[PDB]
Every structure is written in C-alpha cells, then in structure tokens.
Amino acid sequence: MTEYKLVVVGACGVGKSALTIQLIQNHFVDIEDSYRKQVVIDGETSLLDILDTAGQSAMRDQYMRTGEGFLLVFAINNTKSFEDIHHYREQIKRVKDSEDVPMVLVGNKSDLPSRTVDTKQAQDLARSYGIPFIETSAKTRQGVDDAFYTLVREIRKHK
C-alpha cells in the first residue's frame, strides 16, 4: 500500500491544523501537530501521513526532506500570510535540493467576508510557480478534500 508524506506549511493562524483536522476527523471547532489516516483516492488506497508546521527544529528539517508534497497555505484575510508564501516555497526547494517538488497553493478561510488577498493575486502567483490553486474553508469544508487529493495527484504525476 502506498504512503504519502505530506507537509502543510504556512504562517501561524492561517488554518493548517483546522484544514487537516477537517480532512482527518471530519469536524471543525472554533492540539495535535501530526495526523495519519488511510483514505481512498481515485480508487487507490493511500495512507496519508501529514505534518502541520509554520517553521517556528530537527524534526522539521527532517520532515521537509522526506515530505513528498507540500500545501502552501495562506488565509484570504491575512495579507502577510500571502506574502510569506514565497519564503516557504524557497525554503522547501533549498532543502529538497530540487526544482520539481509537488506543491499546491491553498487560500483558506474562504467563508469569511474579510478579504485582503484577491483571488486574482493568488491565481497569478500559482501560475508563476506552475502549481494548482485551491480556495478552501476548514469551517464549511469547501475545497478541503480537493486540496489534499490534488496534492496526492501532483505527487503521482511526479513519479
């Protein structure tokens, strides 16, 4: 059976944990740093081993090296978190020592009316990196499966 090591990166408070909890435990409440569950994606059974991190040591650099795919998460009501995305992508590329690393850009908190990051901005950035962009809400579950499953699919095309 296939195991996919995924890493969810992004600034503090963007909803990395909420997204992962929603995926794995199917709920949202307004504490675990890692998660593990077997799911079926496009008919293939996959064990997802997922780490949520903001980069703020030995475990971290380790999980980056072996992480096979990365969700780059920002919140649509957090301009700084969007600006931080470049730093996260560059850091990953450095540690992987590679230019073809599976990634997906995730704009979370899409249910909220406060928006300071335009969808156009995010789409343009994703196009530049050559990766998918998915709008999500850990609260409503919008895009949650799609974000993670799309990443798994990026990992497959990569191999």
Nearer to ligand GDP, 36 or 127 (CB): 36
Q: How far apart are CA 36 and CA 140, in angstroms?
A: 22
Least separation in angstroms between residue 107's CB and ligand GDP is 10
Residues in contact with ligand GDP, shown as a per-residue x/- string from 121 to 140 under the rule CB under 6 A? ----------------xxx-
CA-closest candidate to residue 107, choices 88, 127, 130, 126: 126
The conformation of residue 138, written as its DSSP 8-state character, comes to T
Residue written as tokens 């979370």? 108
Residues in contact with ligand GDP, shown as a per-residue x/- string from 71 to 110 under the rule CB under 6 A? -------------------------------------xx-
Residues in contact with ligand GDP, shown as a per-residue x/- string from 15 to 34 under the rule CB under 6 A? xxxx-----------x----
Q: Which long-range contacts (CB under 8 A, 24 or more apart) does 64-67 make?
A: 64/7, 64/91, 64/92, 64/95, 64/96, 65/95, 65/96, 66/5, 67/5, 67/6, 67/7, 67/92
Least separation in angstroms between residue 9's CB and ligand GDP is 9
Nearer to ligand GDP, 49 or 156 (CB): 49
Which residues would be at the binding site for ligand GDP (CB under 6 A)?
10, 12-18, 30, 52, 108-109, 111-112, 137-139
